[PDB]
């Protein structure tokens, strides 16, 4: 009986909608690309002419937009999603944005009797397809219990991480650490090579020692030692993530010196045209400056 | 077999005892009385000075504070090197640059003395249990010669490369430990400010791409408990970061993340936290912001 | 004058002055010559100039320095991004309210130069803060440092302006608010990101000033950022 | 008949000795390089066989050595200068070293009745020749008054900056700021150019604005805009100075984040082979990384 809406049907939105449809959940949908609407309508989705129509028909609405500015335009802007929602509707914003962004939307939403929830996800498109996404939720207890059953169809590990802004927050904190750990690894590996260590032995030893991190596990063999930096996690995206951390630090008055430094190092890689390569490509900032070769 | 100990610190003492427990002959001298007496009770043969330990021993262990003191002890007037019989191996566990050890192996070699860097990790508890991780820079021939003795005092014995490369790999590992911790410190304070429980961050980040051994070693035992007694002293982690920066300067390798981590740990030392576990560096940000992480 | 800080007006005026808090408020308020003195990125101004140009309106960035005292005395330094023709047009009016009127380049270069200047002010101050604490810890009186460094190669306007009046007095009221200096450093980082120019010194200065803000020092003069190191180390400079 | 000694006669030592000789003060001297001793002996210096010889004959001894390690070797090492000094002798160490380096040495000197003072100088070789050096002295009041008249021949502005280690300290603090200000300038200028500013526009405007520094005044036109980074103040030396600051920060438990970052940026320049160029050549780090052209030539 509960009605689900999708404002946009991207790489994530589409498989999520399909998984909901396979549980016989009523799903309304609009996307600017017609073919995306048609893809889900074939699995039983009900197409809508625009965002407002999805809003008016739905109880729980999913969205994932590129930034806070677009969220505000879509939600609060002229003829916005918020104005077209019935009271008691829940908006589930999976956009990669700062907690403060979500807090300010939740405020405007609350006045209209609309519940606004940050629920960023991890697992990618493959996790989206399999319905195994990790979903980190910032909400009241009452609202989390409201939406949890629907979340449990599209994801596997559903975390109630705190109140509003907490989903966005935990993602930002995780990705900040990934970026910092990688930036630290980049210069460390160059130093080790300069001091006569083969990357193989640094991998073997540090991998079993206290210096180890997921950053190193994920990147050293596949990207750094291969020298193939195609694919993976784009340096531009990692940089964007570090910027979101810095935005959160500014808004919360929390100094972030390591994050700040990592951000500028990755900016160096971008300056060198490496933005679309996996983020571990940032090691090339140091290789080129020193003539030390790690990525053999 | 004749083992010698130039100095008998927190590490030297238990190492000598473990060797004595295997019935190996151990000669020893220390700066103070009581340390020699401690091991002589376990079967050690006391010596009047360094020069006397050197003459009697086949394998000599030392761990000195810096390269300058190594220089003075080894090569200085009436030094250890001059008193060693050819074919003697010196095992230097001092936290020093590879070049320091290179410089010293070169003078040793002309005397027919083998000089190997063998820094250790595991602390005094690992020293007592004989479970130290030992990272060795040496020739293959020299490693096989000392390995059986190393195997009594340590568990994981690594032949990491030739002379100094042992210093190098320890420096690279501990640099990463320090950077990963410094990054974690600010990240956790940000997360709490954005309304996350430390527990929550531990769960999620521990299972995601931000994770590191730093977090897994320190979070629950020290940070969440708020008990920063023991562990790995902030002074020692700072020293290690300094050795990295020395190596970076000597090799012309920029180390911006390391450099920033060093100054953050200096802040902790400025606050009187040098004797606490290195994770107490989080108090830098706690004091400045008023954000409390270190509670349960 | 849209606003009078420290379309009724639009329809009547030939030259309109405004200074708004950020680019978001500019594009709300905006979207004849418009002289935008707002503290914004060059790109922000470039977008507003393009929409303005479409309906025959000239849009210039003319950020100023000199503060309220310079505003009162009519001695403001004004940095202008515009065409030659448009600068020629507005210059006589600019010359009443300011002294040194610079035609720094075309649209936005005016934003650029103020951002680059204020970045350096912030970095120079952040560097000064830790330097002074080091000196005192090593047994130097602030007075001795002011004398020697003021005459040698370490000197900067930052030191010249802040050292005696704020730091040594300990009176951090007034001056140039730490929040505003931090805002300026942020604009530099925004420009660095947009232009793919690494700004490591700026980035660290920004975080050091954020520490001051975390300590509640945001409305004090920016040289108050020295308190970050004073509180952390126990070292006192800000007497004498 | 005060007796002055020189342990080494470099670019600074030589003209200092000559200025002292022109006041008719007795000057003893030794240097590894023989021609340096001959240069001053022609102006009336008395040559010595070695450092100890100079030490035994002199009341006030000048030295300027490359680092704290060499200071210890020369002063305290086997057959050192300290062992050969008579009690009441004053050592004036102009070496570029940390305050702690000097404090250690002063303590070993003090037990032998020898006064040890840090007196680093500024003004360069031209100031050394003209006798117009600025001299920053860390010492007791009694010891400063003792040596001040001799200092006043070789220098013009003689500062009693504090007790032992304060001369070293003030120099370190000044040069730290120079290095930081330059590092900040480097990235700032690249940003400005990328945003469409000419270097001339920035020099003109920032030079008359709150962003200005001596770093910018000294380097912008002569080195950066010319693109000629020959001469000036070597990047290696500025880097060394920033290292001394970090050493003092560690010893005093004073965090130095801006200094630390400046140090690593200048290390980048050294990594690119720029160590012998003027330190403003550090801007080439960002030019190479970005493709942005600021420096001329």
UniProtKB/Swiss-Prot annotation, chain A:
Keywords: NAD, Oxidoreductase. SUPFAM superfamilies: 6-phosphogluconate dehydrogenase C-terminal domain-like (SSF48179), NAD(P)-binding Rossmann-fold domains (SSF51735). The active site is at residue 171. GO terms for biological process: nicotinate catabolic process. Homotetramer. InterPro entries: 3-OH-isobutyrate_DH-rel_CS (IPR002204), 6-PGluconate_DH-like_C_sf (IPR008927), 6PGD_dom2 (IPR013328), 6PGDH_NADP-bd (IPR006115), HIBADH-like_NADP-bd (IPR029154), HIBADH-related (IPR015815), NAD(P)-bd_dom_sf (IPR036291). Catalyzes the conversion of 2-formylglutarate to (S)-2-hydroxymethylglutarate. Has very low activity with (S)-3-hydroxyisobutyrate. Its EC number is 1.1.1.291. NAD(+) binds at residues 5-19, 96, 240. The gene is Hgd. GO terms for molecular function: 2-hydroxymethylglutarate dehydrogenase activity; NAD binding; NADP binding. It is an enzyme of class 1 (oxidoreductase). The keyword Oxidoreductase applies. Belongs to the HIBADH-related family. It comes from the Bacteria. It comes from Eubacterium barkeri. The keyword Transferase does not apply. This is 2-(hydroxymethyl)glutarate dehydrogenase.
Swiss-Prot record, chain B:
NAD(+) binds at residues 4-18, 95, 239. Keywords: NAD, Oxidoreductase. It catalyses: (S)-2-hydroxymethylglutarate + NAD(+) = 2-formylglutarate + NADH + H(+). Its EC number is 1.1.1.291. Pathway: Cofactor degradation; nicotinate degradation; propanoate and pyruvate from 6-hydroxynicotinate: step 3/8. One of its GO terms (molecular function) is NAD binding. The active site is at 170. It is an enzyme of class 1 (oxidoreductase). GO terms for biological process: nicotinate catabolic process. Homotetramer. Belongs to the HIBADH-related family. Catalyzes the conversion of 2-formylglutarate to (S)-2-hydroxymethylglutarate. Has very low activity with (S)-3-hydroxyisobutyrate. This is 2-(hydroxymethyl)glutarate dehydrogenase.
